[PDB]
Design a protein around this ligand. Structure first.
Ligand SMILES: [Mg+2]
Ligand SMILES: [Mg+2]
Ligand SMILES: [Mg+2]
Ligand SMILES: [Mg+2]
Ligand SMILES: [Mg+2]
Ligand SMILES: [Mg+2]
Ligand SMILES: [Mg+2]
Ligand SMILES: [Mg+2]
Ligand SMILES: [Mg+2]
Ligand SMILES: [Mg+2]
Ligand SMILES: [Mg+2]
Ligand SMILES: [Mg+2]
Ligand SMILES: [Mg+2]
Ligand SMILES: [Mg+2]
Ligand SMILES: [Mg+2]
Ligand SMILES: [Mg+2]
Ligand SMILES: [Mg+2]
Ligand SMILES: [Mg+2]
Ligand SMILES: [Mg+2]
Ligand SMILES: [Mg+2]
Ligand SMILES: [Mg+2]
Ligand SMILES: [Mg+2]
Ligand SMILES: [Mg+2]
Ligand SMILES: [Mg+2]
Ligand SMILES: [Mg+2]
Ligand SMILES: [Mg+2]
Ligand SMILES: [Mg+2]
Ligand SMILES: [Mg+2]
Lengths: 122, 72, 175
RNA sequence: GUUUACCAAAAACAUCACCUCUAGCAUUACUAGUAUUAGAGGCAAUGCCUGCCCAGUGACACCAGUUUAACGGCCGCGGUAUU
RNA sequence: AGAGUUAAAUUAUAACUAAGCUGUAAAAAGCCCUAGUUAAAAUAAAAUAACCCACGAAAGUGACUCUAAUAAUCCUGACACACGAUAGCUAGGACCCAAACUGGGAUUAGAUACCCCACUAUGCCUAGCCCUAAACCCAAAUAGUUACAUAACAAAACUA
């Protein structure tokens, strides 16, 4: 996976959520991006009341879409998602799996700094 | 210590700024007068070139534009 | 300007066996369409080094360094058009140009035959450093223009006087 | 550039520029236009600027309050450093 | 360097309650179209993380996401070229909050200051200038040594 969209859809019914996901994925595909996987994180309570599309949203469904897209179509998809009234807060980031985990060596014992002052007698 | 020299320079700069503020327009008149003479000297220096080159008149298509009296 | 196709099959997956037999999805994923600017820079660098240089393995050579800096200079110029206010990138481009010019001077001093071919293939016009680097102010520019015009008028008048004298002597020698 | 044809052609008017106010709109002006617009005005390109005041009279506000690039105004008395 | 987004606070804006609110060592002035709670756009800035010491040549940079991207197979080197904190200028826009100046209220013999209140340029965005700082880490750059050796203080003395 290259890019990861953390879609926050408005809390709605099952057919409406399915239609919104279908049209969002079709919009993603129209831009020249193949979709790897879609994972539903469940409908949770929002940490804060997000105000979007002149509506106060207290709940929302979380979805995660990982895909491969060209670097030029990220903002176009962001613009398309910004005008969708069924999306609370869309965000496209780099997929964490792209960055390989580095060797966490651990704490290295750093000695106290010496020779910071001259040896003149006080 | 060095604060004495710093304060002396500060006082000199403050007095110079006050003098400039008090005599601003006289300084502007002097600057304009000196720029006038600068432009005249440049014009005469340019004239002397073709005077000593043998030409009796300035080359055709030559205007000698002002370079020191330009507006802000 | 070079036009790398979006399906160029970048070099990281270009030299591996069994790459043309894979399906269009994997080919598109491994192609330049899904790649960033760094992969296109690598493709342009290899394409230029294969066609301009004679020994692509020798990277430490001056001709290799010049063509390596050429793609970076072109990328910086491409970025500058989109980012007019990017002072850091402008400084990077200007210093890369100076480094390339210094390497071109060294290459011209060392091997002239390679220098000429590099310049002809890259389109770079090497200009000798003008002595007495000065800031041409208005007074100097005006005086230089006046002197040039005066010299041209004086030589034109002298040529006309010479023609008139030649005509007069030709007329007088006949009768 | 214009003006007192017929005693006055200008230091007068206008003028580009700079400032104000008045107007969210359709079949005759403005205008077959729509605030970067259109009218009622002041002063005059450009350069430096345009300092204080709503106490009075106006104008918005239908009373307070705001306005001077609105009408307009921006001080006395007495002694003092060595004459 | 561009494009997109906002968690806390505040405010234009409405409703209920109440009379003061703000203000300082103490007061006065100011607002009572005031104060508290509940909802609330736009602008500005970016708590803890940071006991971290990274990036960039320096200035400078630490709310989040995306794109581009951080020269030199690496010596020194200008009056040449390109940058250059805040402040100021020009044209257009925004203006919660802070604030030069200013006007009031305190204190003082005087206070055109420190203290409180209101407000302007300005700090905010685009483009174009201006090119100055205790631009200081007051310690030039490049490769080194701990030999001789404490004017004083301070960041120890030194080589090519
Ligand atoms: Mg002095
Ligand atoms: Mg006339
Ligand atoms: Mg007439
Ligand atoms: Mg008459
Ligand atoms: Mg007449
Ligand atoms: Mg006349
Ligand atoms: Mg007459
Ligand atoms: Mg007149
Ligand atoms: Mg003006
Ligand atoms: Mg005038
Ligand atoms: Mg006035
Ligand atoms: Mg009044
Ligand atoms: Mg009044
Ligand atoms: Mg910007
Ligand atoms: Mg507002
Ligand atoms: Mg009171
Ligand atoms: Mg923050
Ligand atoms: Mg580097
Ligand atoms: Mg150098
Ligand atoms: Mg500024
Ligand atoms: Mg302001
Ligand atoms: Mg304030
Ligand atoms: Mg006061
Ligand atoms: Mg600057
Ligand atoms: Mg500093
Ligand atoms: Mg110094
Ligand atoms: Mg140096
Ligand atoms: Mg001692």
């Amino acid at each position: 996976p290259r890019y990861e969209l953390a879609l926050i859809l408005k809390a709605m019914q099952r057919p409406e959520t399915a239609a919104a996901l279908k049209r969002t994925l079709e919009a993603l595909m129209d831009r020249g991006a193949v979709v790897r996987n879609l994972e539903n994180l469940g409908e949770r309570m929002l940490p804060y009341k997000i105000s979007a599309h002149n509506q106060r949203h207290s709940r929302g469904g979380y979805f995660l879409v990982d895909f491969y897209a060209p670097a030029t179509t990220v903002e176009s998809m962001m613009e398309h998602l910004s005008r969708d009234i069924d999306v609370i807060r869309p965000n496209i980031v780099k997929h964490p799996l792209t960055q390989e985990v580095k060797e966490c060596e651990g704490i290295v014992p750093v000695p106290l700094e010496e020779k910071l002052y001259s040896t003149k007698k006080r | 210590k060095n604060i004495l020299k710093i304060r002396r320079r500060k006082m000199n700069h403050h007095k110079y700024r006050k003098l400039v503020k008090r005599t601003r327009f006289l300084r502007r008149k002097v600057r304009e007068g000196r720029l006038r003479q600068k432009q005249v000297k440049f014009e005469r220096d340019l004239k002397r070139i073709w005077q000593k080159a043998g030409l009796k008149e300035a080359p055709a298509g030559w205007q000698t534009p002002k370079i020191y009296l330009k507006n802000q | 300007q070079d036009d790398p196709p979006p399906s160029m099959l970048l070099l990281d997956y270009q030299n591996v066996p069994g790459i043309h037999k894979v399906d269009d999805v994997v080919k598109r994923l491994l192609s330049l369409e899904m790649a960033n600017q760094k992969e296109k820079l690598k493709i342009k660098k290899m394409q230029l080094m294969n066609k301009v240089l004679e020994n692509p393995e020798d990277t430490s050579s001056l001709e290799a360094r010049i063509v390596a800096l050429t793609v970076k200079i072109r990328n910086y110029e491409e970025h500058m058009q989109k980012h007019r206010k990017d002072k850091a990138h402008k400084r990077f481009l200007l210093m890369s140009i100076d480094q390339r010019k210094k390497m071109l001077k060294n290459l011209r001093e060392t091997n002239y035959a390679v220098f000429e071919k590099i310049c002809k293939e890259l389109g770079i016009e090497y200009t000798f450093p003008p002595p007495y680097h000065r800031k041409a102010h208005r007074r100097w520019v005006t005086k230089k223009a006046l002197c040039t015009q005066v010299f041209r008028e004086v030589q034109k008048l002298k040529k006309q006087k010479r023609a008139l004298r030649a005509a007069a002597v030709a007329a007088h020698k006949q009768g």
